[PDB]
């Protein structure tokens, strides 16, 4: 671990001292020491790395994006400076990117991350990290290049494999992603044991018919990523009551269900009207959930925020729902019409979060053909009647009627969730 150019060995005694103050928690004192050792040796890398590290720690205790922001500069400044050992160079700059990501300036992170591949082109671990920078801003095709290059040279990088498998699954290369996900998981390299790759491998094997897919859901549970082999959401609050099927009473939203079940024809009529006259507002499902068929959706609220244009189109419905913040405010849920046509089979899948239940309201239900399965039980809609399930559980749908099928979906906060918890949780 090379951390002193020679000139930093010269002045080690003073450097040791400052860091002393910091490993004993006197982070204001420590920062100021390093500040004066840095004004006193403006070229000392370790002094500068000293200021930057205490600026980190201060920013953790102060829980302050600004303290942090100013340390990201100082980490940069260390690598701007001459005769910087390579260890301090990499660590300083890696620190910078991994923090920039924290604060969410990914554009920024990536540039530090590509600076870092230029500086060390023989580091597969740093390519790997850059590939991650690409995924976090959605740039899948560059992520795919990084990992293909890594794997060309270290073909067993456990970490490039789950990530490569992640990326091909995302492109619906379901057949090909499996061996990468599987191999990448068994590798045990550091980074493989994420529930994300567990979730996605078992899904891939399901969509190709592989019965082994539930041996891996038991596993991902038994490593502790999934609540259960049936319930594999990953954005959760540990605690919440977990059943696939609820009753209006069980949820304590008995009023919402009522304002829905008694005003169901209007809800329908407004969505039929949009179908007949504003069909553009209905949008194709774009999350790769369909084996086959047509399924479009007209969304009125998303992440607890209302869509004004959409609500010009079902306007009495948006007024009637504004009465209920348990759903209009679910920043982890949607409210939307969902029209599904014959020939349709929706792959088994899970939502992202346990933090929400999902109400369906029958609006136009054809008399045969429309199954939904959530775990062990199978159920059907009734017009003017509401169903409730925990979409964090595994659900699958078929539409094999002779005409279209329309329902209203209304997401509510998981009812055991307390007010401050609805204020805090990240929106999804």
């Amino acid at each position: 671990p090379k951390l002193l150019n020679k000139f930093d060995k010269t002045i080690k005694a003073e450097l040791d001292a400052a860091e002393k103050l910091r490993k004993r928690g006197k982070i204001e004192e420590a920062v100021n020491a390093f500040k004066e050792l840095v004004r006193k040796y403006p070229q000392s890398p370790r002094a500068r790395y000293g200021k930057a590290q205490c600026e980190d720690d201060l920013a953790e205790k102060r829980r302050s994006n600004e303290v942090l922001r100013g340390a990201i500069e100082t980490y940069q400044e260390v690598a701007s400076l001459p005769d910087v050992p390579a260890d301090l160079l990499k660590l300083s700059l890696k620190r910078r990117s991994d923090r920039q990501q924290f604060l969410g300036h990914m554009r920024g992170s990536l540039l530090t991350l590509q600076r870092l591949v230029q500086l060390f082109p023989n580091d597969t671990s740093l390519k790997n990290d850059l590939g991650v920078g690409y995924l976090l801003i959605g740039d899948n095709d560059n992520a795919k290049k990084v990992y293909e290059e890594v794997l060309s040279v270290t073909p067993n990088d456990g970490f490039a494999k789950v990530h490569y498998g992640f990326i091909l699954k995302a492109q619906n290369k379901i057949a090909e992603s499996i061996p990468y996900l599987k191999e990448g998981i068994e590798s045990g390299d550091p980074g493989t044991d994420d529930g994300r790759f567990y979730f996605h491998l078992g899904d891939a094997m399901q969509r190709v018919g592989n019965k082994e897919a539930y041996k891996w859901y038991e596993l991902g549970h038994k490593r502790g990523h999934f609540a259960s082999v049936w319930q594999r959401s990953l954005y959760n609050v540990n605690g919440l009551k977990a059943q696939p099927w609820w009753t209006p009473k069980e949820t304590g939203y008995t009023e919402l269900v009522k304002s829905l079940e008694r005003n169901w024809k209007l809800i329908r009529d407004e969505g039929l009207a949009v179908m007949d006259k504003a069909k553009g507002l209905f949008l194709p499902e774009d999350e790769n959930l369909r084996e086959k068929g047509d399924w479009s959706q007209f969304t009125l609220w998303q992440q607890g925020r209302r869509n004004e244009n959409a609500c010009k189109g079902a306007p009495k419905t948006c007024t009637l729902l504004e009465k209920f913040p348990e759903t209009t405010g679910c920043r982890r849920g949607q409210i939307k019409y969902s029209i599904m046509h014959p020939g349709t089979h929706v792959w088994p899948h899970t939502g992202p979060t346990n933090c929400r239940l999902r109400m369906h309201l029958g609006l136009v239900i054809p008399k045969e053909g429309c199954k939904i399965r959530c775990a062990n039980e199978t159920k059907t809609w009734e017009e003017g009647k509401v169903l409730i399930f925990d979409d964090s559980f595994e659900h699958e749908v078929w539409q094999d009627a002779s005409s279209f099928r329309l329902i209203f979906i209304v997401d509510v906060w998981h009812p055991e969730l307390t007010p401050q918890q609805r204020r805090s949780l990240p929106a999804i």
Binding site: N65, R196, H200, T350, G351, I428
Partner: peptide, 18 residues
């Protein structure tokens, strides 16, 4: 991308600060 009915994005929440 958002994760609305599924979990196909690499991160579904975009944290950005404390």
């Amino acid at each position: 991308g958002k994760c609305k009915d599924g979990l196909g994005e690499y991160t579904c929440t975009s944290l950005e600060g404390f």
